[PDB]
Amino acid sequence: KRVQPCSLDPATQKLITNIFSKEMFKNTMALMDLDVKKMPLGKLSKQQIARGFEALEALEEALKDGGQSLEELSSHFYTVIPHNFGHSQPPPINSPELLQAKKDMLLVLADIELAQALQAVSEQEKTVEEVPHPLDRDYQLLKCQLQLLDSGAPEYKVIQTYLEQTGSNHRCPTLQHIWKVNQEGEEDRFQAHSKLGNRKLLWHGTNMAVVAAILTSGLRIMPHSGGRVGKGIYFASENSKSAGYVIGMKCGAHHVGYMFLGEVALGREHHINTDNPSLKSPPPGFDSVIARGHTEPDPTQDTELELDGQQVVVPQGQPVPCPEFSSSTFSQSEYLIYQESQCRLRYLLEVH
Numbered sequence: 001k002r003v004q005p006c007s008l009d010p011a012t013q014k015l016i017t018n019i020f021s022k023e024m025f026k027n028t029m030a031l032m033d034l035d036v037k038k039m040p041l042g043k044l045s046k047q048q049i050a051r052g053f054e055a056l057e058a059l060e061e062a063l064k065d066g067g068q069s070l071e072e073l074s075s076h077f078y079t080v081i082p083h084n085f086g087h088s089q090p091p092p093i094n095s096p097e098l099l100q101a102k103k104d105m106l107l108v109l110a111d112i113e114l115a116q117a118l119q120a121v122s123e124q125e126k127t128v129e130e131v132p133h134p135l136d137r138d139y140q141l142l143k144c145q146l147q148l149l150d151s152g153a154p155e156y157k158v159i160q161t162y163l164e165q166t167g168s169n170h171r172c173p174t175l176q177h178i179w180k181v182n183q184e185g186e187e188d189r190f191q192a193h194s195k196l197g198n199r200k201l202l203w204h205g206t207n208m209a210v211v212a213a214i215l216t217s218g219l220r221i222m223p224h225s226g227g228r229v230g231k232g233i234y235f236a237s238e239n240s241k242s243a244g245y246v247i248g249m250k251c252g253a254h255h256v257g258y259m260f261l262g263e264v265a266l267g268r269e270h271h272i273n274t275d276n277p278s279l280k281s282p283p284p285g286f287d288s289v290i291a292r293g294h295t296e297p298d299p300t301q302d303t304e305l306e307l308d309g310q311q312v313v314v315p316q317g318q319p320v321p322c323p324e325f326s327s328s329t330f331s332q333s334e335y336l337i338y339q340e341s342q343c344r345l346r347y348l349l350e351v352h
């Protein structure tokens, strides 16, 4: 079986190496305090996660009797999903906060498993006498087009400022590479929202073990997903807010982190200053709910872009106080869309 040469550039070789690394997914599992010696990457199945979520479904009903205890039902979740706690008694899930924390850990594992199932060798690849370079195979597996952009691009100095001015003042993410993303299948669903305006290019931060799943499926509204403002996709106009979720992985003296830039079609937006986890969609006549923050990049330093004949607002300015929302329960803005079709990824960033 002849191994074909790598057609990808060094930057795209790194990206694919990182996001598809077994060590990276195993390390992401170690950080989520999961026992990788009792739950290996290859043993990780859609049945085990279903069971895990089923065990959290039973716990959720106990907080909201006569049945089993909170210590008895927690014990089963730990028997299903094994954690490394130094061989000591596990703690019971006794709050909505811990419930969603243990729900958000299974939402990462689902993408860790997805990427694994994605890398399965088809019988078409078996009846074929030649194989592509492993990196080129993984790149083909995403069914996504990543275009590495240089300094001499209309959108390079646009995104550079965006990252600088809205990124944390002292802990500034050092930009390395920008890939223009084009997901095949995500084009038409967003094209339907042509009637819906108020287009804004907004950040989205994730840990390295879900990057590939987003490069294959796009950004989703998963069953058992949620947070401070409900079952929608979370976007920040400030880079600092998104970068909190990006766990930096060590690589010599440097740290690796990958960040997304989605195109959010908001339309008639409904603002808020209080947390509402119970949300599943916006109020009628509205298409997006935005949790307004204490600070915001001054909408006077804003720029625009023409992505597929549409005008996308790009915030370029530094955060500024917002007296209309001076008493908001959110320090920084959070943008929520309640239908996947209203997003389309536009850029993948490499930050150090």
Ligand SMILES: COC(=O)[C@H](Cc1ccccc1)NC(=O)CCc1nc2ccccc2c(=O)[nH]1
Pocket (backbone or CB within 6 Å): 104, 107, 108, 111, 203, 204, 205, 206, 207, 208, 210, 234, 235, 236, 241, 242, 243, 245, 246, 333, 334, 335
């Ligand atoms: C591994 O990916 C993550 O870090 C997790 C949970 C999650 C989400 C999707 C798939 C898997 C896991 N969270 C996100 O992708 C969203 C994180 C995020 N939350 C925000 C909340 C408010 C405002 C902005 C953000 C944001 O930019 N990213």
